[PDB]
Design a protein around this nucleic acid. Structure first.
Length: 158
DNA sequence: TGCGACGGTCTGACGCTCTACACAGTGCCAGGGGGAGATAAACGAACGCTGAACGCTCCGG
């Protein structure tokens, strides 16, 4: 399932590359740890392969992902509750869910809201974080350059 | 009630200048009411223009 040198998407950190497989022993049990890293925060993540699906790791989605996130990005008739508190409570939950379709919907609706009137400066931090993690997810999926990854999305979100 | 003792409470702890310094870890926005500043108009005032008009010295044919 998991090999060396491959790219894996980790929640709240985006795409990452695996360095090696670690065989550290805990209580006399040889767990199959794997170590991975990103270029954003300069951190190393060690996850055993047995509970990898439980913690929420996920591989690189092929050609079946960009088309579905584009068609849910272009999906009209999206509505939000009138009170901003319910939508505010929903969006970070959708971000923490880690689904690509959910984060694409959140960034599309939020970008539309910022375009129409302009929300605030506080929400700019989370829009920026979501755009960063989404462009990092799509950058290593299509194997494109990061500047090309952020450039290609500029003509499709309108 | 008398007893020590147990305890709290309270007080200051010589004088001045030469010197003499500053002070730090945990949310967020929408709807609505007031007064600050720009606007264009307004009622009244006095400010000018009209030279006219009164009166003077005036050079004068």
């Amino acid at each position: 399932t998991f090999k060396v040198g491959d790219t894996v998407v980790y929640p709240h950190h985006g795409a990452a590359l695996i360095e090696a497989i670690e065989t550290r022993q805990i209580k006399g049990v040889d767990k199959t740890y794997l170590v991975l890293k990103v270029a954003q925060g300069d951190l190393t993540v060690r996850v055993p392969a047995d509970n990898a699906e439980f913690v929420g790791v996920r591989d690189v989605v092929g050609q079946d992902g960009l088309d579905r996130v584009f068609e849910v990005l272009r999906a009209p008739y999206a509505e939000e509750p009138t009170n901003w508190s319910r939508r505010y409570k929903a969006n970070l939950e959708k971000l923490a869910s880690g689904d690509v379709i959910k984060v694409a919907e959140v960034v599309r609706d939020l970008w539309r809201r910022e375009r129409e009137r302009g929300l605030s400066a506080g929400e700019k931090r989370m829009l920026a974080k979501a755009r960063q993690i989404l462009v990092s997810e799509l950058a290593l999926a299509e194997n494109t350059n990061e500047d090309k990854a952020e450039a290609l999305l500029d003509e499709v979100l309108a």
